[PDB]
Amino acid sequence: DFRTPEFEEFNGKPDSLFFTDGQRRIDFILVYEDESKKGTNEKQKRKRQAYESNLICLVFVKVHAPWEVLCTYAEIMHIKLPFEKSRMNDFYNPATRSRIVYFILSRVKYQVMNNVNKFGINRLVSSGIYKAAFPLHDCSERYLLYREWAHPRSIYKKQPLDLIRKYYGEKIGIYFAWLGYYTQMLLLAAVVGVACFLYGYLDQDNCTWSKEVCDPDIGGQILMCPQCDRLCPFWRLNITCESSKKLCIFDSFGTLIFAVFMGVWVTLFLEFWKRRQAELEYEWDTVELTTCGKCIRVTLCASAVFFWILLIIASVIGIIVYRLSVFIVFSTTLKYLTPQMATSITASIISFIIIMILNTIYEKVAIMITNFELPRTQTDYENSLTMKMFLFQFVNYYSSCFYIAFFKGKFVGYPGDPVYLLGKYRSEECDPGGCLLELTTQLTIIMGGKAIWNNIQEVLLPWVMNLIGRYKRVSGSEKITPRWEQDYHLQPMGKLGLFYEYLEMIIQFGFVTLFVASFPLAPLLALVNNILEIRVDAWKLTTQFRRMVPEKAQDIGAWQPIMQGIAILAVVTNAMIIAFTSDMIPRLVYYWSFSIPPYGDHTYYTMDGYINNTLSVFNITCRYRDFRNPPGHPQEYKHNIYYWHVIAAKLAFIIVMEHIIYSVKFFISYAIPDVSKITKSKIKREKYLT
Amino acid sequence: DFRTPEFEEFNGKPDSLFFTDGQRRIDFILVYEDESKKGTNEKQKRKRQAYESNLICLVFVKVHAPWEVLCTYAEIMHIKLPFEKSRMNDFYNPATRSRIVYFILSRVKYQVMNNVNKFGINRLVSSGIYKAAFPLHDCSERYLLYREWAHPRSIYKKQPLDLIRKYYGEKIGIYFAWLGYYTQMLLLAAVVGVACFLYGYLDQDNCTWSKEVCDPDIGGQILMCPQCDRLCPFWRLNITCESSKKLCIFDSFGTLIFAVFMGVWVTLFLEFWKRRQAELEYEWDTVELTTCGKCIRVTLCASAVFFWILLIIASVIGIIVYRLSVFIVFSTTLKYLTPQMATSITASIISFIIIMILNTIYEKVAIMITNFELPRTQTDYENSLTMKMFLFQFVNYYSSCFYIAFFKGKFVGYPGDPVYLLGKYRSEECDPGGCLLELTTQLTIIMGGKAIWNNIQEVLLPWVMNLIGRYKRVSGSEKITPRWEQDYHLQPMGKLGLFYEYLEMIIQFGFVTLFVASFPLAPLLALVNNILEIRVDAWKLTTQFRRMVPEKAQDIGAWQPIMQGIAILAVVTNAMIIAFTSDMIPRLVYYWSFSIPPYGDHTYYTMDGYINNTLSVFNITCRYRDFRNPPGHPQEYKHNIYYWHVIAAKLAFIIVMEHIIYSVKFFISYAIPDVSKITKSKIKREKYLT
Ligand SMILES: [Ca+2]
Ligand SMILES: [Ca+2]
């Protein structure tokens, strides 16, 4: 009855936000048009027309809710108006104003005489009756947000973090506060992250770690053993040094001050965000408002889902395979481009490419898994997607690094016996450089290669897809184009809005905390990323994408239990980065227990002569990066005291560095009040002083 | 004005709970009398008389609140009356009824013309104006609670846990639910705790662990080295076996199934109490309702407090000293009472005595610390006392065990060099039995000696102190003694009521979870304790002690963050009980890596010949429980491969057993819904179905 908000087609002013009569400002536009399958056109018309009829208090339909109709659902949900505030009304905003008219779009459904009870635009736009329902914005509130925040000129400026909630809402504001804070806490781990390896840069020469390695009369003698079986040469340690001279900054003590700092920093990063969310819990309001057959389907999906997890695990195996083949050519074919780091650059590019391809499969297959599973509407759907998409992106992004980490440079044996992966082909081995540069280049050109490549995808892929709406649809308009046609031609965002833009940071946060024993610059590269990503995600959210609905979330949600699970994992893996993949505990032990006269030939503590005095010679019956017995002895190619010393000091380091840092991350979490103390002085002035 | 509830002295019926007129039932009695310093008697009278005056709507004063006066504070606090319920009134109890008249005793203070504003009986009874304000009870509700619950005849009966809240309240009920549940979860760790060492009891003979030890032709040969310097003999391993034959049940695999079970059990114990408190969150209602100089004083108290902590640490040193002296006599002076276990029984009695003495100092000094510090009234006072009294009782009770645990049987050296505690006196050493029996006897006669001795203190010390009120005050009364005189003569409980009765269980829970690698019966002894302590604390709370005020607490409070800190500590210390103090990882390594031909002389896996093939011989320049090099070799009395193998497998076991169990205690805490599922089906019928 009387549905149609009549087709008074007049669009005289292009930058308009009002009706014909004025003084009425838009909150949201839906659109659908059916004049042109074959017999269901008016069926979708009668499926639509009863919804807008009780809503009352191409051609794109306006909405508006006046004083008597905005307030009658502002008594339903308890809105805080203004200073001080109170629930559900207090007399003294288009960030608030277009959530109430979406709260209006929450309760009211449709009335059928044949029992199809359809509610909201959840199924309305997905079945295909509507095409796009959206809000829109201004030209000002928007124009001053370009010059100060959302421009590449205003990168050095402070963030208008109030003027992000007041324009975009707590879905977006609590991302950009968490992007600005995590930019700030990266800075106090970048400047102390620069400083620690600057001492590693200053002390580059005089510790006999790359001092012996660059001396061809005594560090050129070290004729190693070829890794693969056929077509690999016996090589020396001249050719390592070009990598060994910058290896002296990646782990002398630069890590062991920083990795014991990052364990302190991440529990200072998380716990001061607990104080940061709590003072944004106050200044922004943030308050809440057959069965067996089905079970079997869900279990199959849960079980069916892991296999993909199994598949991603499998791809890395292909990289291991590809690496061996590609590595062999590398030596024959050829700025200090040694084949040890050529394969570590080239075949780490080829892996990173396949990470970006198989992300896009994961981008789609985890959706097709989840809707085939039984979700909730929109809140436990993404929360079932969170532990399913991220857990794909965990093992997509980090299982390559977790290969080059703990279990790549292991598994040698009796003739230099590889494990052979229980197949007829050989297995691979690390180079006697305490292989870390194969990791920290893989770490760099992922977390800096994702930082480059996704900031091309987040910049021009919304740009050229809007030019699909410009070079392919209409060009040369009436030169006064009305506002909603401009804003509709901007592409939408997806139902899950900032899921993809949190996930790409939790991937970055899982690089600056999981793998930071090695690469202390991983704050700095992620500092200059977050200096730009806070403008890139500013720009694409203001120019290109449509206006997100300003829904309210109190914390980030479902990534706070992940970072709290990443940080607990980060103490275990940083300690396993240091012991099992960093070659400094084999140096700490030599300095402290093999240059002393038991098993040693030197008076006081000195690192002179470390490299030949670690490895194991191998009769033809060359040296290699192992702690095994020399041939010709009582128990040859079984282990030494030295492995069993070092693997004990390896495993004691895991035990000491976890139990100290997990106590420090308990003391720091104890000795910090979780709600911030000035806000504890501010919330107590809101209940007794009213 | 008109204070005195007039002295109509008539006490005709002895078991009375009413007034002269009847139909009015008591809730609470205060008492004070001043007819007999020297000039302040009427000063305490005028300090009293204005309080009871506005309360209106030896001789012991009744209280009573009728319908119009009970309800007017039952609208202030939101009481749930009954089935289903609602806040602050709903029309369809002396557990509830005498909390409202204590809620009446919360707001109303006194009116002075000279500014002393005194509120309640907090300072009223502590300054000395009143002597005892208390409630009292019946003869029935009480009489059927004796026959079924609070009698040593009714020990096998099920607990009337509803009929503890409905008589005593959630202060007491949530203790007795937590005493009954922790009795039940001890039972499913007693029956699987009996079973695991019953296989240790069945396989007592055929593993060459006590098979060699009892064979004097080949296990009598092992002429060890005396521990202390003067007056200690060279001894053999005949004399160990009497302890080695029951040592074969304390740790073969009995622990490694149970200690990996107890890590699963305690996170099943805690997490099913989360479901147990939540279904008691529903069935019982449980809903809430100069500065610099001062800072310096608080800091000094905080710092001053540790020293006592330092002192308790110091006493153990005296035990170490006393043990050495007492041990020396033991050998000379003498049911298989070998001196290895005689000192472990006798000098572990003498330590347990001094634990009970220095508990009583800790019982008083932590009070004198806390009131000299700045508390809150009664809630952050005990919560500041919780982390101060228990942390004394932690290091009082467990630092003796943590001495006999990780750092007693260490620190030998070059001539068998003790550390000498940087003094001229010698240090002590363990016996080659993988010293654990010095712990599990210390563990038994503490946690079973406290269980005996405190259940004498909790039984007859309230009994004979009531007989101080019977044999020393009045005997042979009018033979119809009125009720409040009987109940006043029962001794009071203390301000902190069940603090002392939670703490003695958290001490027991810190014995069944911290030290359970060894002594799998520590559930069973604590099962038969909690079978009796749930009747002993039933009996003393019903017969001897006065009626506690039925205040409401939702959970136990301030011991749930302690057991959650005990259980996280329990995974670290059980693994350090197994590796550093249990001698099975030195057996696991021998079986798996020294009976194989590297460093071995036997074809397949066999434990034949373990004991001589572990220890280190010592030239006169005897064997002892060390993994050190034999004299006369390349690096003598420095370590072996074998220490460095075993200490690696020690430290890998800490790493494997923590990271598995902390993941299992993460999976079990994930795969269990914290609110119980039937209550999740029950709370959703209380908000939408009303
Ligand atoms: Ca971005
Ligand atoms: Ca007791």
Short mmCIF file of N, CA and C and ligand atoms in Angstrom, two decimals, chain A residues 175 455 458 504 533 537, ligand 1:
data_model
loop_
_atom_site.label_atom_id
_atom_site.label_comp_id
_atom_site.label_asym_id
_atom_site.label_seq_id
_atom_site.Cartn_x
_atom_site.Cartn_y
_atom_site.Cartn_z
N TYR A 175 40.31 0.41 14.26
CA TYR A 175 41.40 -0.06 13.43
C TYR A 175 42.48 1.01 13.33
N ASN A 455 49.96 -2.96 -1.28
CA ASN A 455 49.76 -1.52 -1.33
C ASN A 455 49.82 -1.07 -2.78
N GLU A 458 45.92 -2.54 -2.83
CA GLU A 458 45.00 -1.67 -2.11
C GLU A 458 44.95 -0.26 -2.68
N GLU A 504 45.94 -8.52 7.24
CA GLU A 504 47.23 -8.19 6.65
C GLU A 504 48.16 -7.51 7.65
N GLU A 533 50.81 2.83 5.19
CA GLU A 533 49.55 2.10 5.24
C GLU A 533 48.50 2.83 6.03
N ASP A 537 45.41 3.09 3.63
CA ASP A 537 44.09 2.75 4.14
C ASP A 537 43.29 3.97 4.53
CA CA C 1 46.00 -1.83 3.96
#
